[PDB]
Design a protein around this nucleic acid. Structure first.
Ligand code: ZN
Lengths: 76, 345, 94
DNA sequence: TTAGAGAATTGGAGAGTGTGTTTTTTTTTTTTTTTTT
DNA sequence: CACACACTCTCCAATTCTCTAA
């Protein structure tokens, strides 16, 4: 039970970090950010979490990219 | 398949007659140019619709015929096919609209920012060591007002007199408004943001339904072969107020043993909520087919449904002193009573 | 006729003006390290500059992917080697 | 040991094929049962 | 009917694997 408790406190700390990354309002609430960048030009990113956290905005701007480099991976 | 024919119309002439009309025309016979002064109210944002009186274009053609220069019968074009001329008058207005003279407080509007960022991005790209659909920036609604009797837009029709031969024409229809929709936004121009290239693209809608874009096609997205994703933004879309109404013919007009027929009226833009149920009204409007779209268009066949785009509306039907003008006659109680239902003795 | 050829990193893009020369000009100004910040914020200040510049050069690809691609191209291209040794030869010359 | 040329396998463009979609539904008459007429 | 979506087929070139000489 102590072993179960310690593990539930680690999963609670992980879910606390997920909750700190999650929307404080609903999925459709729709707020939209524009990021000014050098060469005085714009990008755009959706979601209320991105408005306040510059690091989340740039992480989201990379997450949305639809390319992936092909990986390479490896008897009786 | 697609043959072609010699019609006695040239929209390059008539576009020149329309722009020549707008800049020149003044009703100085009422004693600067009427539509220029009107457009100044539009450019200052003090006005949101342009009413074109067809009865003016007669005075234009009359003055030009009196000057011996044969103006190209323009009223007989715009009664006979009104729909296309809503496009020509908007092009002729935009080419002539004056710069604002009052301050707008410009940066309160979204499109002033979006289109400026789009301007600057094109300069900073094109340094390299239409621009967008014009309907997006039209802050005004155009309407024609028909001929008064002084010709087919003059004679008001019962709903059954509106034969299929009238489609495309400017007509006037007489009846009761029998029911009215709540006002809903129709789209006209849909703005999308690309997530990756950060670039705005516009779809223009001219049908009961449309298909969304989803995949980016900006120069800098396709040049970088980046499969950018498009998301719709209502903040930068252009909507118009849309309200659908139904009109029925008057009991005097229905021939003996028939049933009162009806038309759908579509009212768009500033003309909205000018109609109320139980009004007896003359609506002048552009009679049109509403084409079925998608699968229903195949199975419905050639049998087009139909509607009327409203253009202008004619309803069929001193205070503080007039109460003293009663009181100072005297005996008000007995005279007011005798004045309830005077036909009953 | 063909399918369109894939856009791909190469020195003719990577050496070009907004490119490695843009890094050499702007980065020493825009990237700031201090013990007055936590290490995770210092790492983020470094990574911002390179993430925005990699997005400007090759928006197709993610940042880790762009790093794997740069490793393969700098390993293979003789003109890219010649450019890099030329940068170091300037600093040795001074 | 590095680096560069030639051989094999995988990704995905894009061409091709195949399927589903309109759509409603109250109204008006006729009947048979409960009960409130 | 015809026009979008769902799903399979096929070819082509892009990348990585493997061998050779500098
Ligand atoms: Zn894009």
């Amino acid at each position: 039970g102590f072993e179960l408790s310690k593990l539930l406190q680690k999963e609670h700390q992980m879910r606390k970090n997920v909750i700190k990354h999650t929307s404080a309002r609903h999925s459709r609430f729709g707020g939209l950010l524009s990021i000014q960048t050098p060469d005085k030009t714009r990008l755009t990113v959706s979601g209320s979490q991105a408005l306040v956290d510059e690091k989340i905005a740039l992480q989201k701007l990379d997450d949305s990219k639809k390319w992936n480099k092909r990986i390479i991976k490896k008897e009786g | 398949a697609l043959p072609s024919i010699q019609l006695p119309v040239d929209y390059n002439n008539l576009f020149n007659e329309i722009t020549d009309f707008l800049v020149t025309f003044k009703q100085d016979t009422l004693s600067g140019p009427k539509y220029m002064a009107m457009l100044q109210k539009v450019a200052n944002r003090e006005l949101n619709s342009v009413i074109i009186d067809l009865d003016d274009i007669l005075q234009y053609q009359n003055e030009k015929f009196l000057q011996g220069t044969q103006a190209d019968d323009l009223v007989s074009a715009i009664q006979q096919n009104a729909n296309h001329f809503t496009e020509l008058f908007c092009r002729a207005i935009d080419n002539n609209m004056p710069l604002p003279t009052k301050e707008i407080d410009y940066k309160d509007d979204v499109l002033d920012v979006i289109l400026n960022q789009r301007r600057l991005r094109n300069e900073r790209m094109l340094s390299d060591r239409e621009l967008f659909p014009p309907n997006l920036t039209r802050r005004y609604f155009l309407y024609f007002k028909p001929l008064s009797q002084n010709a087919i837009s003059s004679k008001p029709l019962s709903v059954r007199q509106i034969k299929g031969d009238f489609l495309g024409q400017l007509i006037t229809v007489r009846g009761i408004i029998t029911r009215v929709s709540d006002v809903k936004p129709a789209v006209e121009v849909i703005a999308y943001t690309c997530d990756q290239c950060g670039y705005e693209v516009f779809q223009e809608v001219n049908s009961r339904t449309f298909t969304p874009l989803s995949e980016c096609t900006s120069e800098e997205c396709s040049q970088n072969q980046t499969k950018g994703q498009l998301f719709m933004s209502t903040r930068a879309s252009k909507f118009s107020a849309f309200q659908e109404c139904k009109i029925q013919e008057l009991s005097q007009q229905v021939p003996v043993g028939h049933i009162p027929r009806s038309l759908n009226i579509h009212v768009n833009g500033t003309l909205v909520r000018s109609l109320s149920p139980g009004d007896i009204v003359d609506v002048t409007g552009i009679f049109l087919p509403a084409p079925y779209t998608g699968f229903k268009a195949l199975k419905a066949g050639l049998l087009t449904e139909t509607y009327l785009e409203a253009q202008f509306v004619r309803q069929h039907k001193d205070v503080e002193e007039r109460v003293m003008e009663l009181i100072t006659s005297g005996d008000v109680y007995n005279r007011l009573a005798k004045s309830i239902a005077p036909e009953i003795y | 006729r063909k399918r369109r050829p894939q856009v791909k990193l190469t020195a003719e893009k990577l050496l070009s003006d907004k490119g490695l020369p843009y890094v050499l000009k702007n980065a020493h100004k825009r990237i700031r390290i201090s013990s007055k910040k936590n290490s995770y914020d210092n790492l983020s200040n470094i990574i911002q500059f390179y993430q925005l510049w990699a997005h400007e050069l090759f928006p197709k690809a993610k940042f880790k992917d762009f790093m794997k691609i740069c490793q393969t191209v700098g390993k293979t291209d003789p003109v890219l080697r010649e450019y890099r040794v030329s940068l170091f030869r300037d600093e040795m010359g001074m």
